[PDB]
């Protein structure tokens, strides 16, 4: 056989094993989530505190695209940065020509088509990240999750990395008991909790919480990081809910 040694080769299953191997490196990664809310989206990630030498607050992983789109990912971090760089060129180009900032579904496909292009040839390796992203546009809020095959969908909430199942379990609960909506501020607390919860599947090292959000009311449709009193407030909320 040997169908898995080269990207873009179809196996007899109809599968591309290199993309499936890419997924393992993603599944190996730190946990990260995203939550759709009334008028925005919230993003959050687990950052393993490798050592005490890591300057706290200073290895930021959530990356902004344009002024209105947040992107977080689990897997090979350099691969993630590469994808955002591309995304930023796409939003720059789209704005340059059409004047309006790039709508989220529009942006979703730009990343989707690019990632998918890295499953088309054997001279490239597929991306080693699943990417949670989105924001606010002229039609409202949108959250997307994109995978190494280039597959993506719109999500009510999403998670990837080591704690994806614990995270997905907690996300399904939110979805069921809040069918009329969840406020942007609420989603920031819930996000904190779910990262603390999903950190159990990954708990040799203790971790640093990092949140961001775009809300049409709270941040005016722009991407800002959660800091100071609001960060600590959600850190405390999550600390309650683990005991």
């Amino acid at each position: 056989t040997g169908y898995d040694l080269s990207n873009s080769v179809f196996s007899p299953d109809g599968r591309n094993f290199q993309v499936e191997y890419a997924v393992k490196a993603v599944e190996n990664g730190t946990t990260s989530i995203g939550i759709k809310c009334n008028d925005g989206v919230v993003f959050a990630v687990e950052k393993l505190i490798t050592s005490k030498l890591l300057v706290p607050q200073k290895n930021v992983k959530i990356q902004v695209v344009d002024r209105h789109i947040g992107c977080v990912y689990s897997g090979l971090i350099p691969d993630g940065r590469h994808l955002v760089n591309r995304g930023r060129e796409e939003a720059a180009s789209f704005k340059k020509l059409y004047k309006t900032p790039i709508p989220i579904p529009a942006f979703a496909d730009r990343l989707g088509q690019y990632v998918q292009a890295h499953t088309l040839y054997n001279s490239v390796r597929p991306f080693g990240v699943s990417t949670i992203f989105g924001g606010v546009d002229k039609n409202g809020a949108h959250l997307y999750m994109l995978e190494p095959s280039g597959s993506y969908w719109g999500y009510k909430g999403a998670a990837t990395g080591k704690g994806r199942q614990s995270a997905k379990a907690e996300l399904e609960k939110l979805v069921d008991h809040h069918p009329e909506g969840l406020s942007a501020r609420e989603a920031v607390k819930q996000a904190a909790k779910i990262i603390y919860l999903a950190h159990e599947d990954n708990k040799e090292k203790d971790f640093e919480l990092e949140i961001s959000w775009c809300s049409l009311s709270e941040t005016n449709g722009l991407h800002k990081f959660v800091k100071g009193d609001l960060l600590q407030e959600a850190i405390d909320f999550a600390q309650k809910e683990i005991n």
Partner: protein, 244 residues
């Protein structure tokens, strides 16, 4: 990446042989035999068709013998399609020479350039070599009548009589035996046919499995004529030399 699927067509064996050249020659050894014989007053080209079906259009076909210019022709043994690529190249090359110097191209110069193109495919580019050997028959005012062969290696040599394709070891023995230097074209014609008659893998040699051509001075005073024999003209020559 893609390296994994690369045959490496242009490398040496441990014995210093070009695999693909060796295998092209092995391919060429199953082709219809072609024979060139050079006389003091002209050149003969005779080639055997890959076994014809009764329904093939005999006269309108050209499988073996091609015209390069008015003064030069080639007999082919190998893949026909490969041969055609090289022939159109040779024809153009003869026209560039005429355009540049206002003189017909010297036979060797054309031969050398075709052999140089073949050579290239065995040294660079990673493509398969041309599965073709030519017998060149032609004339120019420096060396007169000339016969050459080239093969997939890009090597070329001159001949008084020579064969390519199938059974060339058998054919070269029979040519070596009966060829004389004083020989006239009409005897060379007879030799060519008698030689194919013996080496053929067919039960009998008939007109409809032959391509035949001569280059003589047999027109008007020191000017050269190429003759690609029609079916009937070969059929007559077959009877006059007593092979049918």
């Amino acid at each position: 990446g893609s390296r994994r699927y690369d045959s490496r067509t242009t490398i040496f064996s441990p014995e210093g042989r070009l695999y693909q050249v060796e295998y092209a020659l092995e391919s060429i050894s199953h082709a219809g035999t072609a024979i060139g014989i050079m006389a003091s007053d002209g050149i003969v080209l005779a080639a055997e068709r890959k076994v014809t079906s009764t329904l093939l259009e005999q006269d309108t076909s050209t499988e073996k013998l091609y015209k390069l210019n008015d003064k030069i022709a080639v007999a082919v043994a190998g893949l026909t399609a490969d041969a055609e690529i090289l022939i159109n190249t040779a024809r153009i090359h003869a026209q560039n020479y005429l355009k540049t110097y206002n003189e017909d191209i010297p036979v060797e110069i054309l031969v050398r350039r075709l052999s140089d193109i073949k050579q290239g495919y065995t040294q660079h580019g990673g493509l398969r070599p041309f599965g073709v050997s030519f017998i060149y028959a032609g004339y120019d005012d420096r060396y007169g009548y000339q016969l050459y062969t080239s093969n997939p290696s890009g090597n070329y040599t001159g001949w008084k009589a020579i064969s390519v394709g199938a059974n060339t070891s058998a054919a070269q023995t029979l040519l070596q035996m009966d060829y004389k230097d004083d020989m006239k074209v009409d005897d060379a014609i007879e030799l060519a046919l008698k030689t194919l008659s013996k080496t053929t893998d067919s039960s009998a040699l008939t007109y409809d499995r032959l391509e035949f051509a001569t280059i003589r001075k047999g027109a008007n005073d020191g000017e050269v004529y190429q003759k690609i024999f029609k079916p009937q003209e070969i059929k007559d020559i077959l009877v006059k030399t007593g092979i049918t």
